[PDB]
Amino acid sequence: YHEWKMALFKPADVILDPDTANAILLVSEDQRSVQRAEEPRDLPDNPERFEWHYCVLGCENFTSGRHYWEVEVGDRKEWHIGVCSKNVERKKGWVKMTPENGYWTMGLTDGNKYRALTEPRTNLKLPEPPRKVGIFLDYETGEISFYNATDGSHIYTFPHASFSEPLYPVFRILTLEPTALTICPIP
């Protein structure tokens, strides 16, 4: 676990907002888990919804302060998570997931390639695959960090960002597989 960190970072109750979710995503009834469907649902235009990225956001954003949440990634072979700005482009095709486009994310491809989605990408070497990922956000200092949340081991912290928009938790899954992404409860 972590020591002085909790105290400094307020644990956030993150629930997924199905109005943002791409039509290919399946948000659970309790709004804690997201899975990918075999085929898109048929959903009318909604400014909130991601039409290109296979993305869903948390319901609430952050404009100030320090916050922590944990995401259970389990054995899923592909996922990316972090935060993004309120004002990202939700409609346009082929927008790269990068800080410059409003995303601060990391995760896994093909079960074994961990990356921080900087531009260019930063390749990460994990001594053990994490199953739960702790995300620490400090809005004012412009820091977002990722940890293995079960042993508390630091993985990666982005270069400083000066955030000038509200930030959402963001979750991306590209592939169809058995294990969902799940937001862990608070205490």
Swiss-Prot record:
Subcellular localization(s) per the UniProt record: Cell membrane
Tissue: Detected in peripheral blood mononuclear cells and in T-cells (at protein level). Detected in spleen and lymphocytes.
B30.2/SPRY domain mapped to chain residues: 1-187
Superkingdom, taxonomy of origin: Eukaryota
Protein modification: N-glycosylated.
Function noted in UniProt: Plays a role in T-cell responses in the adaptive immune response.
Self-association state and partner proteins as the record states: Homodimer.
Family: Belongs to the immunoglobulin superfamily. BTN/MOG family.
Name by which UniProt lists this protein: Butyrophilin subfamily 3 member A3
The species this protein was found in: Homo sapiens
Full-sequence portion shown in this chain: 329 to 515 of 584
